[PDB]
Amino acid sequence: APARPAHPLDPLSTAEIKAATNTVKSYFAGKKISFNTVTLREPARKAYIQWKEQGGPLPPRLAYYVILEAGKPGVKEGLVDLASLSVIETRALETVQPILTVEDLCSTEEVIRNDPAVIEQCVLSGIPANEMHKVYCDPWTIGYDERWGTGKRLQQALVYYRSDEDDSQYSHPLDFCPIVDTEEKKVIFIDIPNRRRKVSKHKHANFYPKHMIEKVGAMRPEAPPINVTQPEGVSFKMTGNVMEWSNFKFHIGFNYREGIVLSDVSYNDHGNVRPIFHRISLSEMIVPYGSPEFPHQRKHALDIGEYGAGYMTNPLSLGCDCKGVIHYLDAHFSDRAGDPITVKNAVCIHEEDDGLLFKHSDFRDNFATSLVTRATKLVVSQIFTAANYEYCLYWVFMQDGAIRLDIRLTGILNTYILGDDEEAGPWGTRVYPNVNAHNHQHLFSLRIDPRIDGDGNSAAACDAKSSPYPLGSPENMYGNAFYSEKTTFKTVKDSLTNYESATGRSWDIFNPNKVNPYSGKPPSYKLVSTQCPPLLAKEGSLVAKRAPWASHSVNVVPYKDNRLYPSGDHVPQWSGDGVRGMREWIGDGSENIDNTDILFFHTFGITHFPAPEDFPLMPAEPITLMLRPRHFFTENPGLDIQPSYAMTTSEAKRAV
Amino acid sequence: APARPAHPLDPLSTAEIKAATNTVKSYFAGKKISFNTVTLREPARKAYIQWKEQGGPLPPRLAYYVILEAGKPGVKEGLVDLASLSVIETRALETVQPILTVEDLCSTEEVIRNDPAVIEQCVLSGIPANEMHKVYCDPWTIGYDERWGTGKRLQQALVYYRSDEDDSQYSHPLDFCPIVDTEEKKVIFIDIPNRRRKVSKHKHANFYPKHMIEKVGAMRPEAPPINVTQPEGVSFKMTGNVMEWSNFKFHIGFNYREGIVLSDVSYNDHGNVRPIFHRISLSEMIVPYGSPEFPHQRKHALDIGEYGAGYMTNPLSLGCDCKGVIHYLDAHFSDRAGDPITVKNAVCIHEEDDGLLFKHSDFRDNFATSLVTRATKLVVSQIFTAANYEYCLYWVFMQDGAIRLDIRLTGILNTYILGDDEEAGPWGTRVYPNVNAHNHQHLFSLRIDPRIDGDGNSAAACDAKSSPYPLGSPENMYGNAFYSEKTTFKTVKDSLTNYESATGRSWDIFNPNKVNPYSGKPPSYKLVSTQCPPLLAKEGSLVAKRAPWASHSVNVVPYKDNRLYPSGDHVPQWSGDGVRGMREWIGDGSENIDNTDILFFHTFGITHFPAPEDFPLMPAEPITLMLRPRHFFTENPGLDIQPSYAMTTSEAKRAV
Ligand SMILES: [Zn+2]
Numbered sequence A, B: 001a002p003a004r005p006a007h008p009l010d011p012l013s014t015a016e017i018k019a020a021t022n023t024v025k026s027y028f029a030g031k032k033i034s035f036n037t038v039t040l041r042e043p044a045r046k047a048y049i050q051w052k053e054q055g056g057p058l059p060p061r062l063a064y065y066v067i068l069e070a071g072k073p074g075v076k077e078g079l080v081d082l083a084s085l086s087v088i089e090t091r092a093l094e095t096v097q098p099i100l101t102v103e104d105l106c107s108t109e110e111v112i113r114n115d116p117a118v119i120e121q122c123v124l125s126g127i128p129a130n131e132m133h134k135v136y137c138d139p140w141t142i143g144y145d146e147r148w149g150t151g152k153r154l155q156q157a158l159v160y161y162r163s164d165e166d167d168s169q170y171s172h173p174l175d176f177c178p179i180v181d182t183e184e185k186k187v188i189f190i191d192i193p194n195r196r197r198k199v200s201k202h203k204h205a206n207f208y209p210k211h212m213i214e215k216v217g218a219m220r221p222e223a224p225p226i227n228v229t230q231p232e233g234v235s236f237k238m239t240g241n242v243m244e245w246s247n248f249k250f251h252i253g254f255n256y257r258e259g260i261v262l263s264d265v266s267y268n269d270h271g272n273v274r275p276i277f278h279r280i281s282l283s284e285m286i287v288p289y290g291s292p293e294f295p296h297q298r299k300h301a302l303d304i305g306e307y308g309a310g311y312m313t314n315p316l317s318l319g320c321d322c323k324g325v326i327h328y329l330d331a332h333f334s335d336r337a338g339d340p341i342t343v344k345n346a347v348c349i350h351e352e353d354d355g356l357l358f359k360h361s362d363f364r365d366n367f368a369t370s371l372v373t374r375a376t377k378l379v380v381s382q383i384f385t386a387a388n389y390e391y392c393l394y395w396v397f398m399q400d401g402a403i404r405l406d407i408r409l410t411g412i413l414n415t416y417i418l419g420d421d422e423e424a425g426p427w428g429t430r431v432y433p434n435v436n437a438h439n440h441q442h443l444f445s446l447r448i449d450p451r452i453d454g455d456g457n458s459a460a461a462c463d464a465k466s467s468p469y470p471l472g473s474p475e476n477m478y479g480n481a482f483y484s485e486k487t488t489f490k491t492v493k494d495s496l497t498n499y500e501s502a503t504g505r506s507w508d509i510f511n512p513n514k515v516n517p518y519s520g521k522p523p524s525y526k527l528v529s530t531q532c533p534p535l536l537a538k539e540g541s542l543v544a545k546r547a548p549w550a551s552h553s554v555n556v557v558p559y560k561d562n563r564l565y566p567s568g569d570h571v572p573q574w575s576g577d578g579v580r581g582m583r584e585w586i587g588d589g590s591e592n593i594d595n596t597d598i599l600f601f602h603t604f605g606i607t608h609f610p611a612p613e614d615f616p617l618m619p620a621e622p623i624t625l626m627l628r629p630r631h632f633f634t635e636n637p638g639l640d641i642q643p644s645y646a647m648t649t650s651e652a653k654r655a656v
């Protein structure tokens, strides 16, 4: 039996992973099985909390596994109790398909390169059979194809051409789409368009220095350096995966799917350690493309559920992605064979200056009376690559007690071929000759398990509204009166709400069992999110059905153990029909969500209309949302931070 | 005659100011006059452009002045031609009141302190007559009071109490509001509430270290330092007021009213110097409070037009407001006597790291193939104080060609007294015992004079929309189709539009006389603004009438010289009745704004619902909007920037 971790929420160590896989291999003795997922099965919320603050028993270390068996359809999943090295729970799901690992994907390219039918298509497209080594493809989930359901594990290959291995293939997509059987490693069908478009005869749109030197005249001269040094160390303190900074204390976890997982978040309010969130993370996402033409409906990847923000994460060291005195965390997964794999520097932690926290000067002595305090922020981040795109995720903690999620989208646009005399139409943009970048949205589902100042929470929408009384009335004589209308969700159905520019809507997550001694309102953390696009895909569409959580900016359901993934546990190839995930949690919409243990799922993101500026490599596009304490504290929580400058009125006078 | 400036758009030098005032004093020989405003009268748009790019004549240096004459009502304004030292234009406006200078304000406090009636009120409120030196007040424009119109120049004093000079008076407001005659320096009336509330007997809510040490236990220990050094200098180049950075070239101007004014903005697109904006700045603002009770309707200050972001600007040196290798600019105004006054380090310019500009790695060789380029941003900023509040303004230029306006709101909440058994009701929040922070909005009017890739521009609203075709139709089989609906404004009336969350609305400012050779769309800069609150004050209200521009997120009118200030040139005490400012520019809404010289006024800001966290000193609240190039360039404009890391596929292979 492997050693227990330091903390119940720590990810499975490599030893625990081996232990888990050995256990499963034994249980299925004499069966050819392969490992798709071996990850920590977190303790029940209750167990964790009791252990943490009621002297409760240590929760057992459990490992969740997903495997495939040669010749058997679908998958098998279960739990391994590491202490006793045994399978304690197991079941077979023959009509489902699992997340696609790098091994499942890193091999599709070679199979299409060697497929006679694919070769014939390349030849017809203008690439001779002896140049197949110049043909490339990004292996995608087939998403969903009614021609096969989950009856076969499939991938669809978006084909591209490289004139030279160092080229960026995206300026040269081919017009067809092979469909590959993941287990059989072979092409079973190829979607061929009615209107054929042969390879672009243009130069590739490249972005490395040597390419740029040839493209524009030369590179710009290296700019004078901007050095950031922390000579005396950092203010934060890492103890294992536990972080302590500016009164915040939380556990930094990580898994193959969600990537970073922040847990057991609390704030030390001058000795009174107050809980804020039990768990927070990105639980899923979907990038629905808007071209109605076949087979483009199959482009609506749920990167988190179908590839995994953990599995695709970039080793952060080299890129100079994290500037300053960094603290890194590695990630551990399992490979197909059940052996632990490690991706180094998967998460980086650092703190950086963030301008002014607050300031105020008295005009009376010409601002000689003044106090200025600079702000510093705690950043916990990762960068993962979903084939063409790169998602930079930054969890930010601030000195006023706010928590923010900043995402920067970069990488390369998904592209499809465009005929010389073809208009990108209303569905896409011609960002380069013969290149069509299709419209699409980038949507994310933020999962918040709150514990605002303790247990028993509620949620509400807050809308700014003018007084109902008219101009000239005794109640609103000059018609300037306005207030905040708070609608607290009593039932799940009440929470299904969207962002509203008309009222500057924001959402409150509060503890109705307490009151702020000054304001009289319950302590709360307010979600201030504005990049909340409506789901453009029609109701009842493929996209709307497989991502039921995306239809509303906010979804609030009662807490239940293991309610993590909004689009179900096994996303690839699910048609979206059925009661699972968010659709299951919502139920008939009648369960109570007022003053209980609740789960708050927020949908945010952007609607991406490509433009030449995004090609051939896109400048980082920002996305952000934040949670601010409101009525949580009785006053600015950062006033005990040493001002960077401070002069009292009496001091200014005596100073001459 | 004073020496000409280096650049036609430079602010009046101190010598030019003296010259202007001497000239005016002479013209009004034998009259007791005082100077309210002496500032640069910028050259006509045409003149400037012709001079700049057509070998046109140098525009004459002109100074705009506003003066008062003892015994005469209203003001007198005109122009002085500096070259010939003479008044070339002049007129009297007897029914208007001008912007309130620091001199006009710094004296009201003493007049109320010595007023018998005010003293009586203080005594009734619980402050003995011999402690008047402990009574303070923030001198405000009366805003607008139907009892006096513009017939008298008035101020209203928000009264406060300090138990000790080093206290922050805002925890102790008194219940009455004296009304002072600015020219006569005397109290002419006092608004007294029906329900009296005597001074708070609570301790002041203070925020200096000594106060905090007494309040909480002690200050936190100074955190390890975070040093930012630029050992080899900066990449930007300042030539007078002209800035050159990352291909951007623009003129940094500054005046008593708008504060920072960025002009003649262009981008060097590999030798092709392309115009973007002719002028950009904050042209006005309004902070309407939402308590209907008298006399709170008078709280809707237009800080820019009634006090001036220039006049109230903070000398940036000391506070450690600008971190790193800074470049400063001083500001020059005139005092009542016509002598030049200087506020040092009014504007600071610096560049700082801004994370990743872009990145992409190829999963094929496990991300060994990768390119990462860090971003650096150019920041031009100022901080001004409007009595209780501080506004931090940051004009940001980025390496992808985007321009952004970041504002951080800090300082102190406006407060009114609250009775022991009085509820802050729906109009405010009790942020401290006996303290009521009224609801209110912070609204700004961004003024953009575009020249997108040249002359002749248009504007349009862009809305994301689902295909009108239904799910299951040949046109939209799977119902995922969506596009961008562009409504280009033909007439002024068409432009009166608001932000719409339902369509993720954004606005385009484009040049309809050109096309992007790849996308086929006109080059443009897209306004991406989301903090666009609707004006809560009722239609026909005091607030709605004096700030006609605030009713819509966007206002587009034809260009005319001297169309700067949306609420008129002389804002204090204007009732809002009349055809001036934006109401005049809009006219009957029928003038053409399609492919001409246009002016784009954007309303953005926040709706502030106070909470204890904001008191006694508020943590900086963010506000931002940006203008991105879309179809302006033919590809990512920052690709010729040296990557901070780059490894080619062929390089990765040979690297072993
Ligand atoms: Zn995109």
Ligand SMILES: [Zn+2]
Pocket (backbone or CB within 6 Å): B413, B440, B442, B608
């Ligand atoms: Zn405010």
